[PDB]
Design a protein around this ligand. Structure first.
Ligand SMILES: [Ca+2]
Ligand SMILES: [Ca+2]
Lengths: 155, 151
């Protein structure tokens, strides 16, 4: 095993190259970048440009998808189901991708924008909305389980 | 350099380890997590709970610290993330080089941060550039060697 410092530089350099080759967009958010790749492969959707802030992937049938992803360490850690801030509701559905400790897909779900809003909380500190990816959201009857589909593409 | 598939496995394995060691939390902010670890270790401070958004680390003497970090590879790289709360005692600025060794680090009182920030209307917050002029004096403390020590 190597030092923490080297590991960061190992990860940042690999991501930097993957980013120049056009497979990913940013190098700044590994879990989100991975989930984008995975949702792009599972749908053959097109990536947004970096400038498109309301959504990340557009399916060929039209759907605009905001991809939110996070690494989970313990399915029972309720505070770890917290997703990064949403600052625009101008999309058709979100895709929530929860990774385990291996950065393999633990659960993934397609949530209509309406159900996301219903679950969100506004925050003035961040100028956005906070959503917790609780089981009750993940198993909501208008949510699609995308777990095995994203495991079929890598991770 | 290598094949795309190997880079994915190279990045995924490195992240796997960083995450096992507790160095990474959500996976979206590697550099930020590390800078926090370094400032938490260079002090004996406590990490903020989920609800406390105004600061990141509380020192044993009380001080609440908002940590802002960037990898330095050019004024556009000195740009820090948006501040939307002034409810903290000082900011700790951590500039890494590409190897993630600490290149410059500085403890800036809230007053000097405010003095150096400018409000931005489209983002509804304040932006601070970690220029040398801030890093040197203005009554800010050099924390560079201190953060390199806990490395
Ligand atoms: Ca996203
Ligand atoms: Ca921070």
């Amino acid at each position: 095993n190597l030092t923490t410092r080297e590991l960061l530089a190992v990860s940042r350099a690999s991501l930097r190259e993957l980013k120049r080759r056009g497979v990913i967009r940013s190098g700044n958010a590994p879990a989100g970048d991975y989930a984008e790749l995975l949702v792009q492969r599972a749908t053959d959707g097109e990536l947004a440009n970096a400038s498109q802030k309301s959504w990340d992937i557009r399916t060929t049938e039209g759907d605009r998808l905001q991809v939110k992803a996070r690494v989970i360490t313990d399915e029972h850690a309720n505070g770890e189901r917290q997703l990064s801030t949403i600052r625009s509701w101008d999309f058709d559905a979100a895709v929530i991708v929860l990774f385990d400790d291996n950065f393999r897909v633990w659960r993934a779900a397609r949530v209509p924008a309406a159900i996301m809003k219903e679950a969100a909380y506004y925050s003035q500190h961040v100028r956005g909305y906070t959503v917790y990816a609780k089981d009750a959201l993940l198993n909501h009857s208008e949510v699609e389980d995308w777990t095995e589909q994203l495991r079929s593409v890598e991770q």
